Amino acid sequence: DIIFRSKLPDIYIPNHLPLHSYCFENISEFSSRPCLINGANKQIYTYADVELNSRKVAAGLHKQGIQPKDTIMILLPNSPEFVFAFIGASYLGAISTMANPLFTPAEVVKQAKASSAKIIVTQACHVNKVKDYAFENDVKIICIDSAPEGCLHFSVLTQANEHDIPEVEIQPDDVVALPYSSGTTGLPKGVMLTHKGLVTSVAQQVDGENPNLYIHSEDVMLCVLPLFHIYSLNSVLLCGLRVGAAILIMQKFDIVSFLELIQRYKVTIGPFVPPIVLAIAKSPMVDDYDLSSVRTVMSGAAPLGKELEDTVRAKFPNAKLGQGYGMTEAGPVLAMCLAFAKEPFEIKSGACGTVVRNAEMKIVDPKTGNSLPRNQSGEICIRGDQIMKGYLNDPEATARTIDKEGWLYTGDIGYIDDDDELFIVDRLKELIKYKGFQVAPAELEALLLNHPNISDAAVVPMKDEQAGEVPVAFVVRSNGSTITEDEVKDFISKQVIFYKRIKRVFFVDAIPKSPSGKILRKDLRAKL
Numbered sequence: 067d068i069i070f071r072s073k074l075p076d077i078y079i080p081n082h083l084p085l086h087s088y089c090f091e092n093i094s095e096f097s098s099r100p101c102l103i104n105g106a107n108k109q110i111y112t113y114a115d116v117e118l119n120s121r122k123v124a125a126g127l128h129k130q131g132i133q134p135k136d137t138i139m140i141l142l143p144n145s146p147e148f149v150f151a152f153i154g155a156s157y158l159g160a161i162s163t164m165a166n167p168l169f170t171p172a173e174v175v176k177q178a179k180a181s182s183a184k185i186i187v188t189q190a191c192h193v194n195k196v197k198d199y200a201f202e203n204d205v206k207i208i209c210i211d212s213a214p215e216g217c218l219h220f221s222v223l224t225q226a227n228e229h230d231i232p233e234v235e236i237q238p239d240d241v242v243a244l245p246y247s248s249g250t251t252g253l254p255k256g257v258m259l260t261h262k263g264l265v266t267s268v269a270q271q272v273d274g275e276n277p278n279l280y281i282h283s284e285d286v287m288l289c290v291l292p293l294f295h296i297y298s299l300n301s302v303l304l305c306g307l308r309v310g311a312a313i314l315i316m317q318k319f320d321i322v323s324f325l326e327l328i329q330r331y332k333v334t335i336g337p338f339v340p341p342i343v344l345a346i347a348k349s350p351m352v353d354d355y356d357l358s359s360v361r362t363v364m365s366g367a368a369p370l371g372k373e374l375e376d377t378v379r380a381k382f383p384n385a386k387l388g389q390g391y392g393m394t395e396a397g398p399v400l401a402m403c404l405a406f407a408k409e410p411f412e413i414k415s416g417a418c419g420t421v422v423r424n425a426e427m428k429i430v431d432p433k434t435g436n437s438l439p440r441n442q443s444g445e446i447c448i449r450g451d452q453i454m455k456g457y458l459n460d461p462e463a464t465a466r467t468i469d470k471e472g473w474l475y476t477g478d479i480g481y482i483d484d485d486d487e488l489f490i491v492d493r494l495k496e497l498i499k500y501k502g503f504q505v506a507p508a509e510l511e512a513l514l515l516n517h518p519n520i521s522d523a524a525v526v527p528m529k530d531e532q533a534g535e536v537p538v539a540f541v542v543r544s545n546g547s548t549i550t551e552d553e554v555k556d557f558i559s560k561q562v563i564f565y566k567r568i569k570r571v572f573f574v575d576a577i578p579k580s581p582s583g584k585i586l587r588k589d590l591r592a593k594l
């Protein structure tokens with residue numbers, strides 16, 4: 067194999083430490099500093115407050131019957147309670163699965179069943195989505211705001227005595243976070259991220275004499291991207307905690323709250339995606355705010371492009387801009403912008419970083435299986451302790467995704483250049499990404515085939531300025547059917563979260579397939 071590595075040296079990583087022990091390892095240095103700032107109500111929790119509340123919640127969860135290797139579901143927007151629940155479960159050697167609170171009842175229940183969640187932590191407004199399921203299956207519902215009848219209030223956890231945490235034996239390979247991802251084909255699967263994996267990933271980002279991302283205890287990091295995706299849970303929360311930074315929580319993006327919070331709290335680190343920068347570009351009010359405190363703008367999920375790069379340079383005059391690359395199964399971070407290093411490296415516009423330290427990357431020709439040299443595009447593969455343990459209860463999908471030599475096959479096409487900078491150029495896998503949210507076409511295709519008037523279906527991404535990609539469907543009608551485009555859309559829209567909505571339907575005689583019987587998705591993308 068032709069193997070690529072970081073321009074940074076390998077470092078010592080204390081991957082034997084439980085995630086909480088690692089994240090709070092240097093807490094004595096940060097004890098009285100702001101840890102979580104709730105942007106809406108201006109409440110500040112210090113590092114001491116957050117460690118203590120997490121321990122209280124651990125005792126509370128223990129009292130509610132959570133044992134090692136049990137799972138809780140967090141169904142919350144960004145909030146201090148999200149953090150206390152996640153870290154609380156970690157202290158017990160238990161698992162947090164995280165879900166978008168805007169999921170439909172069917173979506174929430176599917177994930178609750180797949181994950182065997184024992185408790186669902188949510189808001190009162192979402193109780194109706196899970197109440198019947200939870201009652202029938204002895205799943206406790208705990209609300210952070212007010213508790214409807216049959217539910218508990220989150221104070222039942224925070225009122226617990228921190229000294230009532232049981233003795234716990236946590237192993238490095240124990241699962242601690244369970245985000246869902248459809249990976250390189252098929253339906254959403256549970257991604258088992260471990261103590262060892264997440265400690266490794268966080269260390270790869272922020273540890274070392276020359277860290278790949280230089281952040282420190284004086285930084286103020288905006289947490290507007292959702293904590294229910296590992297993207298922010300890892301790179302914002304866990305990384306921020308490790309270095310003693312303040313994490314400024316937003317429950318929901320709007321341009322005014324965003325600008326006000328950056329100015330008022332003097333945000334120094336801005337973890338964004340391109341739709342946030344597009345909102346900035348399209349809002350003249352931006353020129354009336356001071357965003358000079360921002361020293362680092364990190365973008366990922368999708369290419370920013372030259373115009374949005376220009377917006378960042380114009381509106382964040384003191385910010386270093388860089389793009390990075392992650393995938394849930396990879397821990398998630400594969401490549402990181404070396405312009406962010408304490409001793410920075412030069413970068414090129416359009417790059418998505420350099421492969422993380424303490425890891426190996428190779429580029430594999432899909433036609434041959436052979437590894438490729440510099441400047442030649444192929445399937446990006448990564449190997450290292452930071453990647454997932456595997457898919458929960460899915461050995462087949464695991465074996466198809468991570469090979470016997472430990473290589474994760476991402477389904478992404480890219481190349482590494484002469485300066486060890488990675489560029490993403492194409493996607494081999496069927497995945498659709500709407501503003502950074504996963505849309506699994508296999509899920510939509512299955513929902514479409516449920517309709518009596520639909521014979522065959524194929525869901526593919528269509529390029530979109532506002533969302534990056536939107537789902538579109540090529541649909542074959544049943545015999546003697548006059549189903550309309552709007553009828554197909556409305557049928558789907560009632561069942562799915564907003565981002566999975568089908569935006570165009572194209573009626574065709576047949577779906578292009580290989581002799582084996584698989585959708586020729588590249589051909590359909592070419593048509594669009």
Ligand SMILES: CC(C)(COP(=O)(O)OP(=O)(O)OC[C@H]1O[C@@H](n2cnc3c(N)ncnc32)[C@H](O)[C@@H]1OP(=O)(O)O)[C@@H](O)C(=O)NCCC(=O)NCCS
Nearest residue numbers: 168290291292295297318319339341342367501502503564
């Ligand atoms: C990019 C960004 C912050 C956009 O935030 P946003 O302005 O809230 O826009 P979104 O499209 O995400 O969400 C808004 C939609 O939520 C839906 N929604 C909001 N409240 C709702 C409710 N109470 N009930 C049902 N739907 C609701 C609406 O459809 C709404 O659309 P509208 O505002 O046009 O009516 C956001 O998309 C984001 O966080 N993206 C990255 C996600 C991520 O981290 N992914 C994994 C790692 S890349």
Ligand SMILES: Nc1ncnc2c1ncn2[C@@H]1O[C@H](COP(=O)(O)O)[C@@H](O)[C@H]1O
Nearest residue numbers: 366367368369390391392393394418490
């Ligand atoms: N910087 C990026 N540029 C282009 N695509 C990206 C980038 N970062 C992530 N992706 C895509 O998003 C996938 C990860 O999705 P998720 O697991 O939901 O974070 C990757 O496998 C890529 O297909």
